[PDB]
């Protein structure tokens, strides 16, 4: 597939709530910008081979979430609400008005939550392996079930994620169909070389709305899934087999229940669909974008 391992983007940094957040910023500076939101345990690196399909026709902005990627690492609890506050302010610091969202994992919770609060400002949502309510563990795929249950068990989770760096060395390769190369692994490892900096990677999977907990995250996600269900905004939904957060049966269900939703099968896929078929994801987004103007 010739999947590029390089990250050939000029680094940019903007002051947000007294901290520096890194972001990619390429492509033309008129038109509607496309805002790329990664999740755990990733960063803007996740979008490296999708962005070139879009940059020719649209501005691409891809921030690194606070405590992740090349962004500053303040001493926060790194709950979802921390991420909401920082992204809201990133968005304001960049003077963005209307945007198109391209989102994944916790980047999708952030995006969908920002959309619900600012519906008039989002012209489209491209999403994949995104956060929805997981009412039973039974719907979490077997192969990844014990991994995440352990992440969420008291003290054992921290030892795995902070001490063994398990999210990076274990969960991450598991969530990619193809074998990641060492070069790719080293980019992903980069922000988390020091154990103490791995805090956001532990808090996040403990924020996942699974089996009713944490209750506040469940309610928030349900609220944005309800907004999404009601919203006429154009939607582009990428899915793989068997997936992780989004099983093929869930995508098919959403294909019918979500208004103005086009679904796209990337082929074999787990968690980081971007790593398995970035050419289809990129080119489909690029084809879909011009229609957003009406």
Phi–psi pair at 245, nearest 5 degrees: -70, -30
- Tell me the sheet residues that pair with 21: 14
Residue 204 found at the interface with Na ion (CB under 5 A): yes
Nearest residue (CB) to Na ion, 39 versus 269? 39
Residue ranges in 126-145 that form contacts with Na ion under rule CB under 5 A? none
In the complex, the smallest distance separating the C-beta of residue 196 from Na ion, rounded to whole angstroms, is: 19
Residue 147 found at the interface with Na ion (CB under 5 A): no
Contact between 140 and 146 (Cβ < 8 Å) = no
Nearest residue (CB) to Na ion, 112 versus 204? 204
Contact between 116 and 227 (Cβ < 8 Å) = yes
In the complex, the smallest distance separating the C-beta of residue 184 from Na ion, rounded to whole angstroms, is: 20
Point out which span in 147-155, 205-213, 256-264, 285-293 binds Na ion (CB under 5 A): 205-213
Residue ranges in 31-90 that form contacts with Na ion under rule CB under 5 A? 40
Sign of CA dihedral 36, 104, 91, 113: positive
Residue ranges in 254-273 that form contacts with Na ion under rule CB under 5 A? none
HSE toward the beta carbon, residue 129, CA cutoff 13 A: 27
In the complex, the smallest distance separating the C-beta of residue 27 from Na ion, rounded to whole angstroms, is: 29
In the complex, the smallest distance separating the C-beta of residue 72 from Na ion, rounded to whole angstroms, is: 21
**Exactly one of 63, 111, 205, 234 binds Na ion (CB under 5 A); which one?**
205
What's the angle, vertex CA 277, arms to CA 272 and CA 280, rounded to 5? 130
DSSP 8-class letter at 7: -
Point out which span in 59-67, 133-141, 200-208, 213-221 binds Na ion (CB under 5 A): 200-208
- The runs of H, that is alpha helices, within 204-292 are 215-230, 248-257, 273-276, 278-288
Q: Is 37 helix (H, G, I), strand (E, B) or coil?
A: strand
Listing DSSP states for 177-199 in one string gives: SSPPPHHHHHHHHGGGSSGGGGH
Residue 224 found at the interface with Na ion (CB under 5 A): no
Point out which span in 4-12, 67-75, 143-151, 201-209 binds Na ion (CB under 5 A): 201-209
In the complex, the smallest distance separating the C-beta of residue 151 from Na ion, rounded to whole angstroms, is: 8
DSSP 8-class letter at 213: B
In the complex, the smallest distance separating the C-beta of residue 245 from Na ion, rounded to whole angstroms, is: 9
Binding interface with Na ion (CB under 5 A):
40, 204-205
């Amino acid at each position: 597939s010739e999947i590029g391992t390089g990250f050939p983007f000029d680094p940019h940094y903007v002051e947000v709530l007294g901290e520096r957040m890194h972001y990619v910023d390429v492509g033309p500076r008129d038109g509607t910008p496309v805002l790329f939101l990664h999740g755990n345990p990733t960063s803007s690196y996740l979008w490296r081979n999708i962005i070139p399909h879009v940059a020719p026709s649209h501005r691409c902005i891809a921030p690194d979430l606070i405590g992740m990627g090349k962004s500053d690492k303040p001493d926060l609890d790194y709950f979802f609400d921390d991420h909401v506050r920082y992204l809201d302010a990133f968005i304001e610091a960049l003077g963005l008005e209307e945007v198109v969202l391209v989102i994944h994992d916790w980047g999708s919770a952030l995006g969908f939550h920002w959309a619900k609060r600012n519906p008039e400002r989002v012209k489209g949502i491209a999403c994949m392996e995104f956060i929805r309510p997981i009412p039973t563990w039974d719907e979490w795929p077997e192969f990844a079930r014990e991994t995440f249950q352990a992440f969420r068990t008291a003290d054992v989770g921290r030892e795995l994620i902070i001490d063994q760096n398990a999210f990076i060395e274990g969960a991450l390769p598991m969530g990619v169909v193809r074998p990641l190369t060492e070069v790719e692994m080293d980019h992903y490892r980069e922000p988390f070389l020091k154990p103490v900096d791995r805090e956001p990677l532990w808090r996040f999977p403990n924020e996942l709305p699974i089996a009713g907990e944490p209750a506040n995250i469940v309610a928030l996600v349900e609220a944005y899934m309800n907004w999404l269900h009601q919203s006429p905004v154009p939607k582009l939904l990428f899915w793989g087999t068997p997936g992780v957060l989004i099983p093929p049966a869930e995508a098919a269900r959403l294909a019918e229940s979500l208004p103005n939703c086009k679904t796209v099968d990337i082929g074999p896929g787990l968690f980081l669909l971007q790593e398995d078929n970035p050419d289809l994801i990129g080119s489909e987004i690029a084809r879909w974008l011009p229609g957003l103007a009406g």
